[PDB]
Amino acid sequence: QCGLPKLMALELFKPFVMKRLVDLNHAQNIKSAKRMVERQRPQVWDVLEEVIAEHPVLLNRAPTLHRLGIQAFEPQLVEGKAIQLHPLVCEAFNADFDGDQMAVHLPLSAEAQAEARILMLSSNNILSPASGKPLAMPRLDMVTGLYYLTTLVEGATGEYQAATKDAPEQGVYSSPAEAIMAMDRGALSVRAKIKVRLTELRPPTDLEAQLFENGWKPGDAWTAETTLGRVMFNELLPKSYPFVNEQMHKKVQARIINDLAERFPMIVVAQTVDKLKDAGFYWATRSGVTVSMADVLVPPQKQEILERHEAEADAIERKYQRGALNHTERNESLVKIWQDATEEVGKALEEFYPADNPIITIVKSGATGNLTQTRTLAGMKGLVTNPKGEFIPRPIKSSFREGLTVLEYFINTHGARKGLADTALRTADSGYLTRRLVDVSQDVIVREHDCETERGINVTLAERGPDGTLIRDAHVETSAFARTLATDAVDANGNVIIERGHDLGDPAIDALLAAGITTVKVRSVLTCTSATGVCAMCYGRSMATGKLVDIGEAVGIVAAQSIGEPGTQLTMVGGLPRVQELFEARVPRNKAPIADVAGRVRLEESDKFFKITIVPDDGGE
Amino acid sequence: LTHKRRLSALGPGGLSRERAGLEVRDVHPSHYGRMCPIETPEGPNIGLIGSLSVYARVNPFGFIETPYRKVENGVVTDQIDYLTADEEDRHVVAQANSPTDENGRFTEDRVMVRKKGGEVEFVSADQVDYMDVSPRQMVSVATAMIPFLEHDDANRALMGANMQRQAVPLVRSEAPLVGTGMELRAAIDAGDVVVADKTGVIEEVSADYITVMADDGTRQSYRLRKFARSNHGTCANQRPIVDAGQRVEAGQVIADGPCTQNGEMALGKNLLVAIMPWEGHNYEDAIILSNRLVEEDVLTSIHIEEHEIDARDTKLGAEEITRDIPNVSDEVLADLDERGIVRIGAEVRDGDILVGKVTPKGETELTPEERLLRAIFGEKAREVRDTSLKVPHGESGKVIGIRVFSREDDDELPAGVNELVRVYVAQKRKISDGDKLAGRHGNKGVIGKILPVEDMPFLPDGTPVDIILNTHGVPRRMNIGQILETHLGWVAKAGWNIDVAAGVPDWASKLPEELYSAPADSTVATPVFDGAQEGELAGLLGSTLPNRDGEVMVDADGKSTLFDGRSGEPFPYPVTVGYMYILKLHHLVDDKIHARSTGPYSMITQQPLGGKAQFGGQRFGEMECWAMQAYGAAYTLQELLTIKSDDTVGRVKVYEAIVKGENIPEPGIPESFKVLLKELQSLCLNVEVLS
Amino acid sequence: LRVQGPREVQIHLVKEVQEVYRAQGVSIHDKHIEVIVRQMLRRVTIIDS
Amino acid sequence: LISQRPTLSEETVAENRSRFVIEPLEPGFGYTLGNSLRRTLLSSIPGAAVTSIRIDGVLHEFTTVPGVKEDVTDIILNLKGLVVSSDDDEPVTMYLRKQGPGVVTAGDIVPPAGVTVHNPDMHIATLNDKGKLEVELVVERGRGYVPAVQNKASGAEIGRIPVDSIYSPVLKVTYKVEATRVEQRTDFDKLIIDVETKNSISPRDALASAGGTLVELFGLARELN
Amino acid sequence: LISQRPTLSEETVAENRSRFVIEPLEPGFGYTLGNSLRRTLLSSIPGAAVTSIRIDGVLHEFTTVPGVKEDVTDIILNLKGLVVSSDDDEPVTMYLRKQGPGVVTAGDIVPPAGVTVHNPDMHIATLNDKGKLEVELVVERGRGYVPAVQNKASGAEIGRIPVDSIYSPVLKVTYKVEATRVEQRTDFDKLIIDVETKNSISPRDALASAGGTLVELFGLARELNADSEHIEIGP
Amino acid sequence: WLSAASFQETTRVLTDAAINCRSDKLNGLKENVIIGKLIPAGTGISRYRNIQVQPTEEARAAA
Amino acid sequence: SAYDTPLGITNPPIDELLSRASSKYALVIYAAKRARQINDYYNQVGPLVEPGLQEKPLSIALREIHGDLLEHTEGE
Amino acid sequence: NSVPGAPNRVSFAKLREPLEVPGLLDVQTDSFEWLVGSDRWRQAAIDRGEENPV
Ligand SMILES: [Mg+2]
Ligand SMILES: [Zn+2]
């Protein structure tokens, strides 16, 4: 759902409103209906709400970097002049509420309405088509809520106490309602560990196996050791989902959402994300997270570290005055010393801060920010770069919480301006690259089911070293997952683990590693033999839908958009210029010669140059 | 004021925005004291446009000089010399904020200085030969009005400095509780306030003029601008502040300007703020406001717009300004003056007539149906067609002024123009959802929700807060200076008194005597790079005066216990509460909302025009087409590119189908492709379509 | 491409692009990059006709 | 359990400020009761306020008056602070006339029967030598905040200046909860609610009005037999 | 007089669970109603429940009871699940005795005059073969939820187990406020309250009792000035 | 040649196409939008575009 | 499987609809054709499922597809 | 101190300003006066250490 201003909706639907006014005998003809709509008489607004019902509208935010930049929503009239946007889609649109604007388009034809209602509906596009990770998931405040809801704190009010020779167990509640009653009287902290008898929540897999041999059913009671907050959180998840009983970090929530998407229909995920949003906002409001000058604690050991490193720097300076080291050597030594000082200050800051500090709470929960920002806020700014790009060997010791002096601020401005200017042109370069990528790849479209080819490419899954057990490859999610096997995998003896034409998920890789398989041949677009376009099996499964790609999808545009979307956040060589060089297939700047043929090498240092000669072992040239 | 001190690298003989690399737009060490490193555009003009520093002066050759204090033998001397960049490159300059004795000799053994290459170094006190005039030598006028600037990151400081120039004037203005010392001088330098020319005694004070009898026999009268439209449609209103029989001195402010209060610069309003997330309404930089700001017109502003119409000559006869218009209801022209112009004090809305005008038609060639309709009603085929000036779409407000120029009575109008009529419409806009507010530290945001007073969290004494700002912004944006602003604003509003029974406290050792105690609602000044310190602020928070009931709402840490307005239970943890200076930027949803269903089209391409001035259509760019192709929405894309843009026949047929309630017809052959084909046919290319 | 073969050059291009992208912490499946490479490798220079 | 119905007792802090103690209440009950009372007291108490004004020598609010230090907009803003008490439920007209040197305050208005002004010392404007101020104000009764009504909708002629009306006599309402002892235990709590009003209506009357509104609202819940 | 009088509508969700919708009420009154209504509903209706127990098979080390598979904690929870209704607002003693293999439920308790049990099918424990269960319960009336009262001063009689008391018949109450439209204005609030009580009362009766209690409480304030201008509703 | 001209180097592309006299078959996902014909992808391909629909006899009888 | 009552245009659930079609595009064209037929009938086969008070043709077509009251083919 | 009015505003500044802030509009006015040529400009140029300014 989206909130549409009354005036905007009236203007968009003017013809429909005029039709519904004339046919309802509010106006005698089309001219009268138009005149009534222009003056906005009260009868217009009654018909407007009837007209807009079940009429989706497309929202867009420029620039449209990828597919999810345009999404269909069901409109509803709202007082005022600002469009109301659902918080969960802000990640897809890359939108923030600091003055951004969105454009609204009205589908007219029945085909367009069907496409908007099915293909482009916001609730049907949870996952990212690029990597397949969920996007319409809790973030920022919501996470900070759920985190606080599910964190366990020792020594809390109403904490469970083991039975003694004088009294039985204390913190045991007959049902979650009793726990809520206790919480409402200040007798039970929401984050206090307790024992509670649950009946409507499925227990975890191993507990279910250990307790119910015939399978858990609704109404069966079982005692769980957990906090009231975790119990409330598990009520947001679908009925059949097993109990989690774990602190809700960002990655934990992402894992849960990914599990839901794989094993549950799309509607259930859309409802669960809304429930999580509501709970997260409610408990973020009451999480106690706030910013104050006192909350920004400083490490007591900062002064000693700074004085020691200042003594070291003075020693280096006195050495330099003798002439033992050059200017570049002095700069390098100072840079190393101040890097060490910054690292020690950061370590001290991390150690000193308490667990429940709001600044650390926000970062650790994964809602937003990073520890480097905290270190520069409280600990010390560190080193800054000059216009030339080299590190200045005069660090800004004073943190912003203390306040930089004039000269430190002036030098920091250099790096700030450089970063801003770089970001200014990143967008243009990325847009140009995306345009070229889209244009080149526009011809790749899935045209048939399978080309019936035995060819493919080899992808490694794991490597075995002296430890004996084969360790999984780090880059396996982007290589082996969401692919098809070209040939059957056979272990050392010869038994087949997975037959050809099987989707490679997580269980498939787990089974293959157990059997001892390290490399697998998978069908790929590079080897597709289809006469026109490509085939579904070679491409694999669509990341967005998690199912086999369907005939008629323009995978080329999707690939181009996926490549181009993260371009804006690549440094400006190992960044966007490097990507452009690689894709343009031009001679690299720092060209490295490649051995034409094996043999023995020889070299001769020369004036401003090397020279290398390779003598083939086989042959004489 | 900032516009007049702008240094631009573009223009003839300058750079081009498409041919400017990183090197030119980066900060150079020589800028110190000449070009402000903070104030600069955020967009593609980053680094190409800057502002002159406070103390910078221009050499007749065109080079920018800055003042420095001559120091010899490690003793700062009263002599001041203006140096150029190349001239200072041969000297060692020490920062102003360096300890010095009453005599002038440096107290410390080593001083911080800048060398030839702009490199910062410790040197012996005898090596320095120049010193900075003031700690704020490097900042511009706008940057000088950000309190606690040194605690704010460069990006946020730049954003705040840029935002300060977009504040719209309010109906009533008040100076900030906490600010710099610049607000005063700037207000006088901008020249919008009225300053007495000669010392004397005020004679007569009205809302329109001020008469002052000078000390000698001379007397001077000053005319005050009242409700005068500015270049951007913002009210410019000057009002007196002096009283009859009051002695005034030359250079003393006698009338306030648009955004000034008692001779100081007042761009926004100081209001109570609580730093906490609230039910997700301030999510992603959104802001919640109390309804009080609407009831009391705290953030209300007057906006004036001018409409111009002209009656001129034509080959068919001159067009006349008349009170009678063909085919108009008698009620429509009810507020029109006898001449046909709207009456002052009327309330015009969208589509209302402002000035009545008519133009000769000439040929008629009326259609047979129209001829029959006129015959059955006996209506004359009038010679003139209506061309009256009508209020644009979405406008409103009272009519305040009318100006008429007629060639008959001089009125040297352009050739062919016989009459010129200007109408001024003024409207009072209250803060509403979607309006953009911001602070002085780059913490911008749009208003997402306006709550009734009973819903806002309130202090334990019953006082409700005015604004709720999210807590997740500050730490990652590195603009912690706003928290110090909030603390010091709370300290300023509620008076403070430092007990001096057991001597003076250690933290307050360096505070001037005047800051030992101050009454309630006392304003304070914290100059950039020389102002309130950490420990001083902490102590002042810990030494505030109680309220009317003899109790302190805010503890020594700056946090207070709030109550939930909706549920009624107290919030589990204390919340940071204080006073912040929030200013209203000129980005209001009122003037950017337009939608379109059908409107004017282009001459050649026949596509909809763009812009809110016309019934502008939104551009469906190439990237949107890529997105539609990625979705596989073939039909939506086809209708967007043909039916809704330039399928001339398809447009009218689709309108007819929608009105009649029928299926949408098939599109075909947008006009742009035909134009392209017949353009390629030119320049000798045989382009043709086969079947 | 000239020395080792068409199969290797696509491996090299995919590896380089993925390394650059993941240096910043961005996850893109190799299928998109290999589609781009497939488009990059579609024609042959004729030596003699 | 205990059998002791709660009781309410009042004390007066000032002429227009009072405190009310309700005790004994069940534990965790004072906060919600006080919040409900505060919400009703701040959003439902009826009062009287000026609905529109007309000055002799102006047509709109964006002009000035000869010999008057303040302009029309500032005069309207100053009049916003006027506090009035009315009896009848129909619009009433008050007249304000002044000439020559002096300061026009709220005490210069000549209200008709049934209309009272409780802040006669409020400053409105100042006339120096030739300022002739003639104003007519319209007073009505209502509740809450009502934005100014446009002349065209109200069918008024040019000259009338509609203004925003604030029908609310209550300034500040707060509450606190303390523990009180009973034969059962110290669990029960007492609620102290403090009310400060514009002096147009006594705090007790406003409290009674809020209580009546809440009683009649909860009558719906009680109607289930 | 109000703009539009609100109305209350009921919809049954289950045997002992219902939902009530009050609409359309003026803006800002949704929470004002709902919060106080929930608090009164869940903390003002009087009832009865078990407050202390004593099992003859255990005197120290309250871990397990001989002859039964269920531990002491499980028995305590099952008893907490019991539903009782007394009519003497004073402590009374109930006795439960069982012998031999089988299952002991609420229906096996012998109640005295006045005391009643509404869920005789509630399973209490499983008595093992050649096992005997003999327990006593203390029952009295109260209001709301009261944590277990300590017996540290009972050194002369140790073995009794005090337990948390649930007197309120209402078990769980939730409320929410939504926007709704009347005519052309959408500022109005709709209050939706979900209630679910024990077997000894229906949600309608609890709602009526809470409404009466709130009416009395606010009449306590209205009595100060009877002839005041309170917002009337009409019939 | 339509898409090549739309991409870059319009003058050179058009010159080469003119001297070569090479015709364009309008199926490239980029010239279809220029012509205004619905793209040959997603719902625009013949398989989905030429779907036939008619109620079943069982539902037709009920009416 | 088990889910809360769908609201707005999410009803009927997309999973059930996709269970009766080859892919999303086929379902889109299927619903569009049925809706066009229903509208043409309105303006001279009618809607099989009892339409609501002012249910739009598209929603009626989707409900009919969900109920399995219709059938389609794929020309090629 | 420069302004006779000088609304009260206590300052945390600990450093005395040795030089008063100059006119903020001088960049425009002085340049324009040089362009057209004015008596005050002639006097300033003469005092600055130049003869026969043009
Ligand atoms: Mg933005
Ligand atoms: Zn294939």
Numbering used by the authors:
A (entry chain D): 440 to 1011, 1026 to 1074
B (entry chain C): 440 to 1130
C (entry chain D): 1123 to 1171
D (entry chain A): 2 to 226
E (entry chain B): 2 to 236
F (entry chain D): 1221 to 1283
G (entry chain E): 24 to 67, 76 to 107
H (entry chain C): 21 to 74
Sentences from the paper on this structure:
Mycobacterial HelD is a transcription factor that recycles stalled RNAP by dissociating it from nucleic acids and, if present, from the antibiotic rifampicin. We show that HelD from Mycobacterium smegmatis forms a complex with RNAP associated with the primary sigma factor σA and transcription factor RbpA but not CarD. HelD associates with RNAP by penetrating the primary channel with its β′-clamp opening domain (CO-domain) and the secondary channel with its N-terminal (N-term) domain. Indeed, HelD was shown to remove stalled RNAPs from DNA, thereby recycling RNAP and the template for subsequent rounds of transcription.
Indeed, HelD must be released from the primary channel to allow open complex formation. The major 3D class, at an overall resolution 3.09 Å, was a canonical open complex (RPo) without HelD. Finally, the completion of DNA loading into RNAP fully displaces the entire HelD protein and liberates RNAP for transcription initiation. To dissociate, HelD must exit both the RNAP primary and secondary channels to allow for complete DNA loading and full transcription bubble formation within RPo, and to allow the constituents of the AS to catalyze the first nucleotidyl transfer reaction.
